[PDB]
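Loading example: each entry is read as two labelled lines plus one structure line.
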Amino acid sequence: TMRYQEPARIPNAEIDHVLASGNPEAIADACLSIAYYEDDWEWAFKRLKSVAFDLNRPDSLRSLAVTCVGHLARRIHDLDVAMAEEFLLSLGGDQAVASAASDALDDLRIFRMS
Amino acid sequence: GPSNGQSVLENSVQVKETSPRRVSVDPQTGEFVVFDRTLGDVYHGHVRAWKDLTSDMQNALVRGGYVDR
């Protein structure tokens, strides 16, 4: 059966360590803590992108990071829209993340361009 | 987040077979809820207003037998 988990808040100061050393569940938690609770677009977008672009991370994590970029876009009024869009569009051609890119783009277009 | 996460997730529907993104409606509180995969069968979710759902989301809701209009 599917399991609901509402993201835990990981303190800002611990995030980069978790992203360097952490196992997959730790990393997902960090991505989601960023997605749901951090307000600094630039600080957060930078970190999500490094996960999304990292070829040594499993597709599950890369895809989640994109979905998380979708969440930031939904939540944060002062995002750089053009940067968010170029990012999501630059992924449309590679399959590991394409599907989440499309849904993150849905999030961008609704909350920030409509 | 949503009030009734677990049961609202169980009675949810996948929007498109190309994406694990699902959607449901809380029978109790009446809110519309979007769910995304975390890892494996684990999911997280957020509340949305009717006009913030896409055509696909709304189609898959009404047609699922979840909302009148």
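The longest strand of chain B covers residues 32-39.
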